Design a protein around this ligand. Sequence first.
Ligand SMILES: CCC(=O)SCCNC(=O)CCNC(=O)[C@H](O)C(C)(C)COP(=O)(O)OP(=O)(O)OC[C@H]1O[C@@H](n2cnc3c(N)ncnc32)[C@H](O)[C@@H]1OP(=O)(O)O
Ligand SMILES: *C(=O)CCCC[C@@H]1SC[C@@H]2NC(=O)N[C@@H]21
Lengths: 146, 261, 247, 247
Amino acid sequence: GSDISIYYDPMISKLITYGSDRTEALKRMADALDNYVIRGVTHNIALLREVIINSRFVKGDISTKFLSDVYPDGFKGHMLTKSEKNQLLAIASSLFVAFQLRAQHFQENSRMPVIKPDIANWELSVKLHDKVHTVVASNNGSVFSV
Amino acid sequence: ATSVNERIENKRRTALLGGGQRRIDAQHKRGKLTARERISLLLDPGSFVESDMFVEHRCADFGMAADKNKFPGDSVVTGRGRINGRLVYVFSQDFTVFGGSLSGAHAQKICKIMDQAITVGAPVIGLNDSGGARIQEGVESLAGYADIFLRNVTASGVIPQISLIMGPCAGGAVYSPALTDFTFMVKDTSYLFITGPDVVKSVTNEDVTQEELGGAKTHTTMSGVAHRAFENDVDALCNLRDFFNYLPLSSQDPAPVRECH
Amino acid sequence: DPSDRLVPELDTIVPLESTKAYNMVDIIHSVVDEREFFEIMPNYAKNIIVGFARMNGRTVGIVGNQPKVASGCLDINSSVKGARFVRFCDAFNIPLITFVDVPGFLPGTAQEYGGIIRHGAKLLYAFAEATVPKVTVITRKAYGGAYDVMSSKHLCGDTNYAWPTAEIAVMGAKGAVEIIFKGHENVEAAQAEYIEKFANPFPAAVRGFVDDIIQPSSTRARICCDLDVLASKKVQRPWRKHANIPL
Amino acid sequence: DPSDRLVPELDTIVPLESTKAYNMVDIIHSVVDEREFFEIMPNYAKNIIVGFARMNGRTVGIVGNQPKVASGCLDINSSVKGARFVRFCDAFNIPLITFVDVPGFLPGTAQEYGGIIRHGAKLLYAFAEATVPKVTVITRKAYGGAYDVMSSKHLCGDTNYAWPTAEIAVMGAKGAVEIIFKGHENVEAAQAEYIEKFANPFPAAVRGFVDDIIQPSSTRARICCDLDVLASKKVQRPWRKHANIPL
Ligand SMILES: CCC(=O)SCCNC(=O)CCNC(=O)[C@H](O)C(C)(C)COP(=O)(O)OP(=O)(O)OC[C@H]1O[C@@H](n2cnc3c(N)ncnc32)[C@H](O)[C@@H]1OP(=O)(O)O
Ligand SMILES: *C(=O)CCCC[C@@H]1SC[C@@H]2NC(=O)N[C@@H]21
């Protein structure tokens, strides 16, 4: 319910993590930053997450112009790799199929009984960025094979 | 050796295409789908049962008795299906055959499907894309319109009735959606007016386009006739399918209850 | 028994020629669950068969014409038996499945003196007043008023199908041509046209008197689904203490 | 979505000053299941919001005022749009939830010449004949006859709730003091007493016009439980063929 106004600073919050060493601290930062919920305003969680898992930041060699040179044109987001792209597509397809399956769970009517569809494999077209992927999703309970 | 068996699939193939492949190509060029693929996109896969596939109009005047004017189905596809496992009765008007004009057989099929729906107690969904009454039929089209209106009024409050206008609907074809519970529209491809712009210009001396006179924006912004407007055909079918889950199948049933997490 | 069990054995059970007969109980056995059928009066009025079976586990009453004996023609005993069975099935919310292969009522003075009209009215009333779901399949033929008496669509029937070898007409082509064409004194073109245009199920379908023309192998799978939808059928009729059966 | 989910961001959504507006769609999203709301007529008569949502898995109809557009006033288009939706929801056993923030009807000669009385009567009748469970929440204000038109307790409403910012008053304070205190010429104090005594939900709550004054953060948990106990609501009314809608 708190609102952000033009009068004061844009500081939403201050997240801190502590660990035995630097790697543990960075892992805790990533874990706590992926599990942090803000809805209503636009935050810079993407920038912090990309900076934390940056290879140069992990190695150590940083400067006061670290943010300026790693993104010359500007911020773009997370350039997810092939495996990460496949994981994201599988997660999205599984979520879509789960919503579709949940849509069919009505209470018993006793006058107009329902006949739940028995779709074995869901064939889906997923458009991400500017690419179309063909996905085959199957469900056997709480497990999805994509 | 009998040709009736061959005639079975002959008329089946002629009915599946409707009024020809050229008109289907024109429909696709207009950015619109045909009735059969609309129904396939609306209902659960492998659940559509069609009724009155071989029904043709009885007109025998003004050259409509010719073999080239006899289309099996007569500009409408009627049947039953299931949405998320729930029974529904659906009809879709075929603009390919005679511009969707409603003949005696068209109204007969609609009345039959509505009667079956009201007997079993299931909702009715109508995809509206039609040019109005067929002049060649004569007063038969008016009788069919009156029968559909009477069934709409009788079924009002008994079973839900949803109408989705997907093309230029003019004349009497605009009163049936108004008698239904909810009216949905497709932007840039659906119209709803009683008289066309030409008649308005000839009578009232005013220049107006079809989109301005009866477009989706006009009926969803400053008229209050339609309830929602959707981007295109596929989005309209998806949103209608989502909306159908909210309503009960009949007034004899309580409000639907789903699973919460 | 699965509700979508295909039955290809019914594809060629109806002989091509109209003078050859077949057994109706074979269709009944192939259509119903586990091919189990409890027949009623199996040895009395054998031109009609009635009994109890199960479709998708639900009890169904079955009435059909038997073309083996008397060519499937209706008579006094057959009409009475069918009417009584149909009335019982309707009275206890049992759906009715009808298989129609009938050329009419057999002639003769013994039927007229015995009151064949009253018993035809019996059976016609029995199918007329039924409010249970009714599924009708026309196998070979349905001629004249008997077609109306055999649970036609216009008789508040729920769903009517016709096989590709079905045929609906007022009567056979010979009598129709004789009563219509008398001044032409030629049968070379009249008979051919009448056979090509009124000896097939298309006149009934084009007027919408049958819902669809289905392949025989899809009969069972077609009926079961219809029995799933028609379970909640409900109709209203004018109030009365009772009606006058033509008994 | 758990039925007893707390909704704390509604605790300060209503501004302290009465001249500043807010969005009712935010409250609707915060209250309903999974923050999913199918809005009906979203681009027509925006000073009223109608739609379908779900509470504890049960579909419900949502009708609310929109202070963002036209200060939440009622007019012809909003009256018709709300009335038909309420009639449909009542006709098909769908519960109704109303959010009330309205200063009254929109004045002017254009509204009077268009028949604002008839459409206000339409909306009032639509809420009046409803036999489905009705839950009402007053957010900021409900002035004059509009308070009756928005499913008050006296229209056979089931549950009525008021937030701490609610103001159930006959009319505005200035008009009230100008019609009561005419020759007193000492309105400086009269404002103080009138605001301290009647600019709050206390006059309505002291005589049972609202069931309770609830914290906004407990709104959802308050509604669901009601919808649990009102699912078996059943009332009887005098027989008639139909009524006379004021169309
Ligand atoms: C009030 C109760 C009644 O009796 S209403 C009777 C209908 N009154 C009318 O004035 C019909 C006016 N129709 C039209 O203006 C157009 O067809 C409308 C509906 C605007 C279609 O727009 P558009 O997208 O451009 O398609 P189109 O004009 O190219 O039409 C293609 C084919 O459809 C046909 N069509 C349409 N309506 C009828 C009709 N009522 N009766 C018979 N045919 C109709 C047209 O003949 C046309 O045929 P063709 O393919 O061009 O040869
Ligand atoms: C203004 O409303 C917020 C005051 C706190 C910000 C001040 S001003 C700039 C300095 N930079 C920073 O992070 N805090 C200081």
